[PDB]
């Protein structure tokens, strides 16, 4: 089997590195990734400008300033020469990609763009801040890809996985999860500046606190792997009738 | 009624201010938009850093660097009093937001985080790309907000509106539409840089040569606005059971 | 005479235009210049990234994110052919470029840009900050270019312009000045986060309260236009035999 | 003695902690750095929005997105409690920073703020791309301070240091120099785009091949470390009479 394995973080994360390593034992693994840490900016396809991209070992390439998506199509059109891989996996990311914020994130996005390409897709987040265990975090996202590349992944999906910061044999196991509602509240700081003029400051408060079980939150809070299955299609099919009035 | 609407090319866009205009007529109508254009850039809601907000005229309000989430979450718990509007409005945008491209927008997920707050909301973007009249634009937005403060958006909803850039009496109709792949073939261009190394330009060719009736594509191609109802919750519930075998 | 006229705020700010407008009179006035505010990024000539370059009108062009200083190169080396022109002109800029804050100018750079490829430069920048007179403004500028073209410019030199937002009749003068010490009072205010971590912030106070005479703040705040000779070469010569003892 | 230690690359980079270590035989070193690299991107002092700064250890802070400029004024200010350090040191940093070019530079933009507080200031920069061997230099870069804090640095002047990636015992010796033009020479190559559009790559070539005796370029090309002594003030002084015709 052959994986395309992309990131946000840059082709020199601990993440993406762990992953790739722990992959060997599976297939090939054929890197393309940014050349820095996208995570804070845009995400999209870049149809406007061009795009260096340079071998830094066999199997082994970055898109300068490219973002995962951009990553996702050079490595399928040109390194691949068009012939699908058999995953696009993105991470493992320096971070979670849970609830709400799955909609911002490259690392998610990656994951996107392969199965918009028609390929199944995984993406990978690491739950944690402080001295992440990526090699650890690795030897279960290969147990998944073991898995998937046996029984596959259903139609209209892609899968948004999120591992606690643990030890492999301290995970109590893997639950299928849906995206959870944001696992905080919200409280609006205020502030005057030395002009005085005022300035706010978005805080979330009680992380986790009010956690459902079922939810992507509550599985990583707990010590299990969450996968959530993810529709590529936004589209609601069902409501369509309830909004034909605006046709009218 | 009151709404809240925002934008990402800024407070000062002729898209939003039309829009701004035209909704007076049904309510009130408070501005809380950046002081730039962030649709190049991240468009996550600001945790780790304070936002400045100013006063630019009554209920009109620009967040300095502060990305649609930002305006949305700041309009409603500073500026509203958590006093939850009619409706959140996001737009109108310089351009569109169509298809697999939706993921990536911030004028949509400026309407997506109103619904997360449990406020019913709808983006609005031009399908054009130069001398786009705002101004007729922003007539079928107010009909379509007319329409939806007397009968309501459904379950788990939130309204993803495109609107070709023609005058508003050659608008064929609107349509309920599904959101669409992408309407173009995707080539990769080689060059070769003075120091002799490779970089690529991805190219959009063929824009719309087979767009699918049905599609918001095919609605803004051939004359008449698109409305996509968008799932808030990502979650492809159906499927849950068919990888539950990642469990075992 | 020919003059090539770049900015750092983009090629339709009204201060390249009002300057471009009034320059028609003296001359050809070749346009080159940014798609976009550039004043809060970097100014430095790129040359590991390739950059679009658009005609928007004869003799005026853009430079998609180009730098003043790609601006000042691309319009020398491909827009005029390697013909000098008479001079390089940057401006007007939106605010100020005064005292110790001209090394981080964009306006400032283009000029330089200038005087290093071995054409007469000049900087121009309004000071003010709301409801800026650029026609006005534009008045002296194409004065003092017809006294430049006239008499010339002495060597390793180029000059800093900055011009009060007074109308032409209301301006009391033209002195020349030198780069001026910053003239405010610096004060940092303390605050602390949500999360119970301090945060600064660096507060300017009591602007102009101690400015010299013979300086350029001085000058505008005065009155007056400020024309600052600046040097090119950045080299002490007078001191290296004080630090020789590091040859030791 | 005190010395206030900044960079451009950010507190974690080889260069800042290969300097930071060697100088602990001279006195205490304070560091005060960005969190990323800013080399790209702005290098003036903040004053519109706040910075936070986080401790790191023992007088050792991050400002975050703070540039030098912001890192030498909060340490002078905040952290050093208006005391003034005997020196600010800037670097070491990742790659050259001479000739032209210098004025581009947030390492020496550092050193410049410190001389602006009225601290003797130098920047450190090294003579390399690939495997840059910091804690070599950061013996030369010691050299240099422990005779600056015997002998000091003249009127009006910072200094610019930039040192060859070579071993400390392959170092020829140290050079007092001068300000270099650009050794290189500019060559535009032109490309058409997928769409039939231009675009340029502005190529630097030949570089060093023309570098003259006397200059921080040949210094360092041939096995020499350069100093050079800048000005502070920009101000061509001399030539003040040759443009008060501008005045009449
Ligand atoms: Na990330
Ligand atoms: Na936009
Ligand atoms: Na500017
Ligand atoms: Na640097």
Same mark, same amino acid.
């Given at each position: 089997?052959? =994986? ?57 390439? $970055?898109?300068?300033?490219? $973002? ?55 993406? =990978? ?81 009680? =992380? ?12 990583? %809070? ?7 299955? %993810?529709? %590529? ?16």
């Amino acid at each position: 089997p052959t =994986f395309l394995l992309v990131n946000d973080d840059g082709y020199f994360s601990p993440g993406i590195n762990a992953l790739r390593e722990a992959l060997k034992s599976l297939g090939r693994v054929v890197v393309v990734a940014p050349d820095r840490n996208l995570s804070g900016v845009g995400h999209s396809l870049t149809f406007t400008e061009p795009l260096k991209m340079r071998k830094i070992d066999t199997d082994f390439y $970055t898109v300068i300033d490219g $973002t995962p998506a951009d990553c996702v199509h050079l490595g399928y059109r040109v390194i691949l020469e068009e012939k699908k891989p058999d995953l696009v996996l993105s991470g493992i990311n320096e971070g979670p990609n849970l609830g709400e914020d799955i909609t911002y994130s490259g690392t998610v996005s990656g994951a996107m763009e392969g199965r918009i390409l028609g390929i199944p897709s995984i993406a =990978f987040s690491a739950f944690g801040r402080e001295n992440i265990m990526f090699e650890e975090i690795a030897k279960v996202c290969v147990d998944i890809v073991k898995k998937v590349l046996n029984e596959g992944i259903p139609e209209d999906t892609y899968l948004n996985v999120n591992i606690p910061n643990l030890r492999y044999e301290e995970i109590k196991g893997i639950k299928v999860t849906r995206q959870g509602k944001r696992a905080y509240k919200e409280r609006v700081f205020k502030y005057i500046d030395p002009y005085g003029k005022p300035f706010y400051w978005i805080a979330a408060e009680e =992380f986790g606190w009010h956690a459902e079980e079922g939810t992507d939150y509550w599985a990583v %809070l707990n010590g299990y792997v969450s996968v959530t299955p %993810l529709h %590529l299609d936004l589209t609601n099919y069902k409501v369509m009738k309830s909004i034909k009035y605006l046709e009218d």
